[PDB]
Design a protein around this nucleic acid. Structure first.
Ligand SMILES: [Zn+2]
Lengths: 783, 42
RNA sequence: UUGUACAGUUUGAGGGUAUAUGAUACAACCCGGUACAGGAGAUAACUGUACAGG
């Protein structure tokens, strides 16, 4: 008892009762207990769930806008819920409206036949190139639940040996060759790779893909539901048209995908008072539980029964009838089902805290599905992990769909009805969401954060300015070129580290690698070493921890730091004798081989050395050189400049790898290393005669424009152009030896934009004829 | 202009009055139970 | 930068002006004598909130 009325006098406690009654009519109540933080609390508000100190504070709260709008919303909800079930004439009108909408915008048998003809024509065209492949229609084309405008989605299955990128590229080639398909294009970086075409006679956009699992089965399941239950299709088409009018079907603008509503259209039938569509998972099968529901998953459908399999994390396989085998199925009109659907989604269901799944009657808790409770979540029957309703990640969009549902429910709860965007939205405008930046306000096509969109022509190059550029490049090379004494000191440091490590682990051998031995060595750069054990299932984590512990003993070494979260665990520390950062790795033979390759690439010409050094200094000035910050390592930049040099009208350097296979760590490490006779085996040697400054300006121009990072991989292994799709990768750079490791994989979008901006600024400062120092002007962080 | 909604006073206005609540009534009624729109004299 | 909404200060625009007969040098509001109520102050910049970011 926080306070008792016995203290107040008779008139006083009576007036207090009146005050409590008035506060109650405004949705303010007392407090049974109080928190330690607010011992003076004596009231609370349920609508806002807000603590209140005294009666005066309570009366102050009601005056605010928060409680006023909350009570207004409560009144609107009460008005909506008070409405009774629709009268027969109104429901007949709604059914007629649904029929009209499906007739106008729904698919027809002729459309299905035409799409089948498209698929057959594609099969005939593809026989000579892909005879074994088999094409099928899925999605809206086969489900019948979409619109006639909706595209044609064709999945081509191939023998397991064939790879998806290869088959899709071959499909694109055959489509280009044939004339039946006009406007052949590739969108290989969408959610699923697609080849988009437009048949001349049909004019219907067709998207060809392959290996689309969980989609063919889903569309066949929906097709079976539609065939067995005719009441589904009108509801699905009407709900899709409602979503289109409210402008939420397109996931580009942050809305939910278009087909998701179909999964929802059945869902309310499942969860209704009488389930029209029976569930397909539950306690019927032995060894079933909600925790085990994840392992439980639908497998296939055939002969009007769904077969499902369960594998323990023994295997249990069972078939269940798709539709209830009951003769007393209710004859509910389509309009009644639609109105009940709207009521279910508005004021009769928990969109935020429950997962929409059609497999189990009991509402699966979001926690069981390990999903957030902020927004809608739709469960796809044939992919347990995926939450198909993730495209909506912005609360304003959720509120927009909720308002659409509320207004349409109110409208749907000589009667005449119609589907209209204005009526559903009630004047509210959508909120476009930038899927590229995860932000809101700007569409993907035009957005401030687009590095590719980032141009003006450069001025002409006078001979004196070109000479100045060459001079500054040579100056940078000389300034950042280690001296002989520095190399001797590095060798002595490596020897001392090896000797010290041998004390605890005798037989250890240390080999220098990285900038030190790759030909391009930066002054004061990190000392990279690799340790191996003579005559030696070794755990990298434990070995790195032991090495760090050993190094901690050394007085010269301080601030020992073992790192294992990275792909290659390494010990990073500071050496006083070097006075510099030293990193030691374990069995990093691949690193040594790639460093030797870069050393040869440097030895072929000095232009490569100058270019690499100027690139390194330019990157360091812009504060992107260091890898720990999340930007591309200096190795990526030297790879970029080498790739540029290889691919140029006059080839400055050849592809050593291309011009026997030795497998160490699991990859080939062969590369032509005899530079002395390189001209004999290279027919293009000596073609290049551009100046170092001209060559560097050409590099900057090439990377700023005339190059594509999205559709090409910066790989020096192959002289021929490489495509990102063939690597199934989506800045991307490939190692000379390893093809499964991408240096740009960990590079975030913001840092990529900043790096492109730095490159653009460098192109702006360079190549512009015209500071206290010539060198400083070309290397200035402010510009 | 009008008596306070609480304490039935005249010194402060409805919003101005902030003292703890008191029985609702009007001086004309003279009693808490009786209400103005239905009085014996009318 | 991004979606949101209110704590003190000012001007411009608001609800109020029903229940009155006489006054008040540029030095002064007055004796309300009947209107009815379950009703308690809204908008823009002034750097102080509580939820989402990634
Ligand atoms: Zn009062």
């Amino acid at each position: 008892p926080v306070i008792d009325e016995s203290v107040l006098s008779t008139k006083e406690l009576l007036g207090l009762q009146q005050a409590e009654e008035r506060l109650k009519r405004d949705c303010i109540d007392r407090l049974k207990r109080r928190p330690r933080n607010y011992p003076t609390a004596k009231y609370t508000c349920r609508l806002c769930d807000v603590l209140i100190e005294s009666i005066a504070f309570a009366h102050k709260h009601i005056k605010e806008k928060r409680h006023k709008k909350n009570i207004k919303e409560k009144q609107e909800e009460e008005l909506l819920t008070t409405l009774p079930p629709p009268t027969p004439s109104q429901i007949n009108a709604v059914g007629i409206a649904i029929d009209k909408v499906v007739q106008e915008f729904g698919l027809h048998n002729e459309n299905l036949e035409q799409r089948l003809e498209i698929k057959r024509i594609m099969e005939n065209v593809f026989q000579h190139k892909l005879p074994d492949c088999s094409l099928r229609l899925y999605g809206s084309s086969c489900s019948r639940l979409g619109f006639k405008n909706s595209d044609v989605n064709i999945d081509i299955q191939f023998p397991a040996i064939m790879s998806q990128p290869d088959v899709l590229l071959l499909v694109q080639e055959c489509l280009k060759n044939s004339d039946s398909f006009i406007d052949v294009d590739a969108d290989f970086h969408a959610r699923v790779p697609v080849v988009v075409c437009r048949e001349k006679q049909s004019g219907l956009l067709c998207k060809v893909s392959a290996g689309n699992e969980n989609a063919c089965l889903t569309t066949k399941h929906l097709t079976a539901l539609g065939k067995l239950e005719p009441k589904l299709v009108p509801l699905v088409i009407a709900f899709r048209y409602w979503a289109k009018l409210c402008s939420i079907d397109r996931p580009e603008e942050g809305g939910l995908p278009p087909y998701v509503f179909a999964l929802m259209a059945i869902f309310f039938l499942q969860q209704r008072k009488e389930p029209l569509l029976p569930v397909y998972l539950g306690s019927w099968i032995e060894g079933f539980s909600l925790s085990k529901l994840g392992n439980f998953n639908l497998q296939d459908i055939e002969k009007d029964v769904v077969i499902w399999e369960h594998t323990d994390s023994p295997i249990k396989r069972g078939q269940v009838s798709l539709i209830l085998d009951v003769k007393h199925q209710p004859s509910v009109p389509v309009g009644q089902l639609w109105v009940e659907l709207l009521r279910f989604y508005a004021l009769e269901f928990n969109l935020a805290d429950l997962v929409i799944s059609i497999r189990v009657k009991e509402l699966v808790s979001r926690e069981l599905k390990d999903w957030p409770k902020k927004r809608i979540a739709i469960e796809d029957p044939y992919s347990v992990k995926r939450n198909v309703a993730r495209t909506l990640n912005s609360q304003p969009v959720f509120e927009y769909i909720l308002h659409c549902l509320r207004t349409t429910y109110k409208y749907f709860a000589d009667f005449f009805y119609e589907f209209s965007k204005l009526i559903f939205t009630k004047g509210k405008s959508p909120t476009v969401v930038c899927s590229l930046c995860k932000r809101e306000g700007h569409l993907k096509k035009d957005c401030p954060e687009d590095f590719k969109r980032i141009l003006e022509p450069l001025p002409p190059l006078t001979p004196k300015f070109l000479n100045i550029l060459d001079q500054v490049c040579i100056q940078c090379y000389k300034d950042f070129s280690p001296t002989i004494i520095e190399d001797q000191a590095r060798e002595h440091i490596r020897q001392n580290l090896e000797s010290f490590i041998r004390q605890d682990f005798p037989g250890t051998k240390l080999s220098l690698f990285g900038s030190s031995k790759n030909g391009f060595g930066f002054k004061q750069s990190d000392l990279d070493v690799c340790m191996t054990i003579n005559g030696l299932g070794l755990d990298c984590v434990r070995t790195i921890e032991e090495l760090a512990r050993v190094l901690r003993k050394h007085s010269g070494l301080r601030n020992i730091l073992p790192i294992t979260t990275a792909k290659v665990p390494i010990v990073k520390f500071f050496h006083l004798r070097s006075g510099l950062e030293v990193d030691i790795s374990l069995y990093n033979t691949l690193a040594l081989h790639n460093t030797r390759l870069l050393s040869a690439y440097s030895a072929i010409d000095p232009r490569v050395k100058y270019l690499c050094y100027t690139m390194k200094v330019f990157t360091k000035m812009c504060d992107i050189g260091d890898a720990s910050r999340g930007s591309l390592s200096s190795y990526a930049y030297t790879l970029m400049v080498l790739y540029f040099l290889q691919q140029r009208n006059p080839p400055v350097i050849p592809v050593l790898q291309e011009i026997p296979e030795i497998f160490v760590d699991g990859w080939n490490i062969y590369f032509f290393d005899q530079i002395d006779e390189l001209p004999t085996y290279w027919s293009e040697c000596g073609k290049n005669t551009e100046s170092v400054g001209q060559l560097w300006l050409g590099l900057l121009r090439f990377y700023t424009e005339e190059f594509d990072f999205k559709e090409h991989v910066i790989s020096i292994r192959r002289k021929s152009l490489l495509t990102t799709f063939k690597k199934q990768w989506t800045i991307v750079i490939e190692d000379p030896f390893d093809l499964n490791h991408n240096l740009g994989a960990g590079l975030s979008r913001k840092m990529t934009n900043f790096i492109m901006k730095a490159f653009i600024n460098g192109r702006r400062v360079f190549g512009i004829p015209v500071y206290p120092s010539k060198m400083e002007y070309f290397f200035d962080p402010d510009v | 202009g009008d008596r306070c909604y609480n304490c039935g006073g005249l010194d402060h206005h409805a919003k101005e009055c902030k003292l703890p609540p008191q029985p609702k009534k009007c001086h004309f009624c003279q009693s808490i139970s009786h209400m103005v729109a239905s009085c014996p004299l009318k």
